Write an enzyme that holds these catalytic residues in place. Structure first.
Site, PDB file in Angstrom:
ATOM      1  N   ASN A   1       0.717  -1.155  -0.088  1.00  0.00           N
ATOM      2  CA  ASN A   1       0.043   0.211   0.083  1.00  0.00           C
ATOM      3  C   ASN A   1       0.895   1.248  -0.089  1.00  0.00           C
ATOM      4  O   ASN A   1       0.671   2.156   0.750  1.00  0.00           O
ATOM      5  CB  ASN A   1      -1.026   0.109   1.214  1.00  0.00           C
ATOM      6  CG  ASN A   1      -2.054   0.877   1.224  1.00  0.00           C
ATOM      7  OD1 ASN A   1      -2.814   0.996   0.337  1.00  0.00           O
ATOM      8  ND2 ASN A   1      -2.068   1.876   2.237  1.00  0.00           N
TER       9      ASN A   1
ATOM     10  N   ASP B   1       5.136   6.138   5.408  1.00  0.00           N
ATOM     11  CA  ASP B   1       4.798   4.677   5.186  1.00  0.00           C
ATOM     12  C   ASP B   1       4.750   4.114   6.665  1.00  0.00           C
ATOM     13  O   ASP B   1       5.756   4.588   7.477  1.00  0.00           O
ATOM     14  CB  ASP B   1       5.868   4.050   4.313  1.00  0.00           C
ATOM     15  CG  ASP B   1       5.607   4.390   2.794  1.00  0.00           C
ATOM     16  OD1 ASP B   1       4.505   4.060   2.298  1.00  0.00           O
ATOM     17  OD2 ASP B   1       6.667   5.011   2.244  1.00  0.00           O
TER      18      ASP B   1
ATOM     19  N   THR C   1       2.502   2.498   2.795  1.00  0.00           N
ATOM     20  CA  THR C   1       2.688   1.217   3.834  1.00  0.00           C
ATOM     21  C   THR C   1       2.656   0.279   2.911  1.00  0.00           C
ATOM     22  O   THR C   1       1.882  -0.226   2.303  1.00  0.00           O
ATOM     23  CB  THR C   1       1.763   1.108   5.056  1.00  0.00           C
ATOM     24  OG1 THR C   1       2.047   2.392   5.685  1.00  0.00           O
ATOM     25  CG2 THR C   1       1.924  -0.057   5.773  1.00  0.00           C
ATOM     26  N   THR C   2       3.725  -0.764   3.292  1.00  0.00           N
ATOM     27  CA  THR C   2       3.876  -2.250   2.904  1.00  0.00           C
ATOM     28  C   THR C   2       4.226  -3.169   4.090  1.00  0.00           C
ATOM     29  O   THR C   2       5.047  -2.714   4.705  1.00  0.00           O
ATOM     30  CB  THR C   2       5.068  -2.334   1.549  1.00  0.00           C
ATOM     31  OG1 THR C   2       4.587  -1.336   0.553  1.00  0.00           O
ATOM     32  CG2 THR C   2       4.994  -3.677   1.152  1.00  0.00           C
TER      33      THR C   2
END
Ligand SMILES: [Cl-]
Ligand SMILES: [Cl-]
Ligand SMILES: [Cl-]
Ligand SMILES: [Cl-]
Ligand SMILES: [Cl-]
Ligand SMILES: [Cl-]
Ligand SMILES: [Cl-]
Ligand SMILES: [Cl-]
Lengths: 329, 329, 332, 332
Positions: free
Chosen positions: B200, B280, B241-242
């Site tokens: 994301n 993030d 974000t991830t």
């Protein structure tokens, strides 16, 4: 596809005590020129090594964030405010160069010692002994010399200062190649970004197309390999350091500056692969002279979230990739 | 050059209390099949969101390292030993899904509570509310469902579980595209590596050639842009974000495992750019089932330093890039 | 405090879990109520009798900058955000982090399900393992966290066996010498400055007063007294090797992120005065330092009492004493 | 110890620096020598009279696994390695990190300039700011570090004003109340187990004994007594806001990296008992926890004194007492 610069196998070699070491002002292969008031760079080496030190001097002092990664970090100070950053060869022994800088700065301050007048130098090192056949390391005298040689607006590219004996691509030492140090600079409006790097990676240098450009060169094939190809075949068979600095003039809070450091440092896994490994002592210093405000809101014609520290970090990441490619050229 | 999947602008939308929420077993666009004994994966969603959760269940428990980066981390537990990893949408509200997993595991353990029988679930989240027009989030019941749906050897690619409403490329929301979740798997001899990712990002997904493949798509041009082009022009104009997991079966010490996590996580700045930003909440879990020893010495025909945790990290980094590309497909 | 010398041994420890019971949240009143004047800060405490176990919620609806300091090998933390609308402290080990999800969901509903990134309701949660102190497997669930929020009262704190402190205990060299603690709070107003300390001591170590007396934990029923754990540890080594505390400070003094973080570390370490040993591998010690950002420190740190007397370190020293008082209230 | 009640005010603070003097290293003997039985561990202490300032080197030629715990806003650390052949503690603020370079270079020469990665000689160094306690700008330089190594003696430690402790001082609410400390060490052998503590307390805070008495620092020449800094801080706030310690533990007990790290944190936090306040923004507090990896803990943690009585936490509690004794020796 540059010509190879294999380091070759090391040969019992002499150390500092064996020589009357003369500092040499490093000029490298070419000089980068740039405009960054309040920042000076000096580089010195001993031919006897060859090994050297590169000093970034910010006489007013500048807020700093440090991002250290891997199992082989060699760091002194790591301060949140620095008058100089000292990058050197010689493994942990080369941290002594930064003491030479510190002592010289105390002298320049006329031996004042109020807690606020303390001259702060952060130092980091690469292990550069496999790439030569001597035990000479950057000592106090060499750090002092690098400071003495510092001038505004110049950086010696290639085999200069800390980059004298830097090398890349260490799956096997028969395939390791000499790198160098590198710098790159951009100005955008009033914003200035300077990247300095000394890549001595276990990994290899990779360009924006994904081409391996320095390190892991096989003389039997005439070709460089991404290390993962070696690693994967090694597993199938057997089962069963980069020191760097960004310097900018954009004001960032402690929190912004620290996250900026992390972001730029991680971005270097694009140009150095693998990176941030247990084998590496990767250390990035993010330094700001705190001259230029970012706007209170982050919009522009280019987007609602386009002007902020993350944006700056993305730009700075590109400057740093360019510096890495300079070091490998 | 895939077809665009622009998220579009969000529209005051209803939340969990407004619905009788029925969990749906997520199937995605296609199922990845793989062989990894002792690891199960379940994914559930609410169509009402759409939003979901993806659970990696390792019933025996497994040693874990967590690497969190950026200013928007949403993490629960972050334990060094886990029976499950729960990835979810719903921003911080979606951490509740992991409580559903935890409570269910307590039930399965017949309510035993000895400090060593504690069932440990680490959870991380993405903010997925801009990509839809409701406030539904992954709740306890959805986490329980994802666990209930878990099976060995399957992963639903694309818009499934936590990936239902994931999106990339957030210089401007008009250019943000829906991603998904992704997985990839490799086996080398006895070694197994599974990568799971829910990107994301503020940044975009980039392939190995450097092509931007998902995120920052301009409908006025029909082309995706690397964010740095937007950022640099924004500065020139205005001044003045991830969540992821690796799972492997190779024994690594706490120190090796932690450095492996850092290395693999930084490697993701190849495929996600920028990455590790303030914007993030990037969080990677590195999990090992501690089944396979690495050799005591690191040599092979491929090199003297070719078989070690760094080598494993380089391989795992490639598996993870493949997973990111699956999520963006 | 005047700590009660009498023992309160936990005792030993096939326990039923939550759904075995029709669980009604109870508003915890403890042994006594502390009243404090700190507008913007409320505390709710709820328990399940059937545990007994509970949760304690600090609600700061404006949101407040926070630093988290976590120590030891057994931390159980959710969120750990640098800005919080609530802090949720609970029993039930890692299961009790669910209480904070109850708080979060309730706050979202109170915000009319708005989800803009600047509207996100942020709850950090931490837990103690309180299952050794009772037979059941009941834990603070989402309903209990929501109840603790709903029960929040401005400026009141229930001392003793209340909320997260309901089954807290100290002194775990051997469980036969472990005693129930409680939760505790203390408050000071100095000029305009406000400092609230909240603590839920479930330590491996013992609670120690300012004279160095062990006052709660490691009570040996064969001797009738409590001694420092180190005596047991040293005797154990000579024999066999022959030749969690969750807490919060809340203040109204503005501190930068860097000052607030170091304040958190200072205050947390100061608790090794009142809890010994502390910050052990065995413990999940977590302190939240919260500032409501209402009052400035002076720009220079002088006073009649010294050139370096008015700064965040000074505030940390004062806050450390408030925290020790809270620890002693928990052990009373 | 029996601490001397008499004051040793540092006094106030145009100081000359190193090259102003023909600097001869002096082997520091302090007030008294501690003798300890710990083969493999030597200590050297050297000073310059002209500072006065010095360095103290712990030499462990086999190399030893180390955890570093650093706290506060003023840390001055070099190396901070997870494996060390020496630890160098020095005065001179950040300038005194140079002493550790002297040690490193000397060790390279002793290794006949071998530079294989497994042969690298690793020295971690930490510093105190000791310039307020004297006029000069002399600092521990590379020659002084080399001298401290050359002067290392197995199993001996010079207590008091010696090595890095030569100009150490405590209690810095106001410099008019700051007193010279020293360095200190203590040693215990329990069965087969060995624990050495070394400390150089230059705290913002004061040294406190086990009764809670302030014994060094914050001496008010107008009253003749030392009180806790918190009294000054609270009085300062009421008025103006109206409505480093470097240390090492060395043990022979095997601990994994994770256990050793948490042991370091536990022992370091325990020092807030004897130094108050501690871990402040003002301080560069750094503790090195070193294991020589000679003896195993039992595989299970029981004894007659309890089911959880023989483990790294227990060792940490014992080591914490050794460290408090060392702190009191420094302040004596
Ligand atoms: Cl190398
Ligand atoms: Cl390129
Ligand atoms: Cl988003
Ligand atoms: Cl690709
Ligand atoms: Cl317990
Ligand atoms: Cl309420
Ligand atoms: Cl001082
Ligand atoms: Cl010697």
């Amino acid at each position: 596809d540059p010509a190879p610069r294999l380091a070759g196998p090391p040969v019992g070699g002499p150390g500092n005590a064996a020589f009357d070491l003369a500092p040499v002002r490093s000029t490298g292969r070419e000089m980068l020129r740039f405009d960054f008031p309040g920042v000076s760079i000096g580089a010195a080496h001993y031919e006897e090594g060859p090994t050297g030190a590169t000093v970034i001097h910010i006489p007013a002092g500048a807020r700093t964030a440090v991002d250290a990664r891997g199992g082989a970090v060699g760091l002194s100070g790591g301060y949140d405010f620095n008058h100089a950053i000292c990058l050197a060869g010689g493994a942990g022994y080369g941290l002594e160069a930064g003491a030479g800088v510190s002592g010289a700065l105390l002298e320049r301050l006329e031996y004042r010692t109020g807690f606020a007048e303390l001259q702060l130098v952060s130092s980091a090192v690469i292990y550069d002994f496999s790439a030569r056949s001597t035990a000479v390391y950057p000592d106090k005298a060499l750090g002092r010399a690098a400071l003495e040689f510092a001038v505004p607006g110049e950086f010696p590219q290639g085999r200069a200062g800390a980059g004298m004996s830097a090398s890349a691509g260490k799956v096997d030492w028969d395939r390791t190649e000499i790198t160098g140090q590198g710098a790159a600079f951009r100005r955008l409006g009033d914003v200035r970004i300077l990247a300095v790097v000394v890549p001595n990676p276990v990994g290899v240098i990779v360009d924006r197309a994904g081409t391996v450009v320095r390190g892991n060169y096989d003389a039997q094939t005439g070709v460089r390999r991404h290390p993962v190809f070696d690693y994967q075949e090694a597993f199938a068979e057997q089962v069963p350091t980069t020191i760097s600095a960004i310097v900018t003039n954009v004001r960032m809070s402690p929190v912004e500056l620290n996250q900026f450091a992390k972001q730029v440092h991680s971005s270097m896994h694009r140009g150095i692969q693998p990176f941030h490994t247990d084998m590496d002592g990767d250390t990035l210093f993010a330094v700001t002279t705190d001259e230029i405000d970012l706007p209170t809101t982050p919009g522009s014609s280019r987007g609602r979230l386009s002007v902020n520290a993350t944006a700056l970090g993305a730009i700075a990441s590109e400057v740093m990739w360019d510096a890495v490619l300079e070091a490998g050229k």
